[PDB]
Design a protein around this nucleic acid. Structure first.
Ligand SMILES: [Zn+2]
Length: 29
RNA sequence: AGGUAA
């Protein structure tokens, strides 16, 4: 369930609700 | 839990 950030392409651990690197929320699309 | 290698 890891997820890729639309904004910076970082692959975020499933448990994160915001990107680890750029802080963009998972729902921000 | 675990972060840059994904
Ligand atoms: Zn990001």
């Amino acid at each position: 369930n890891d997820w890729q950030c639309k904004t910076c392409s970082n692959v975020n651990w499933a448990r994160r609700s915001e990107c680890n690197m750029c802080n963009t929320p998972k729902y921000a699309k």
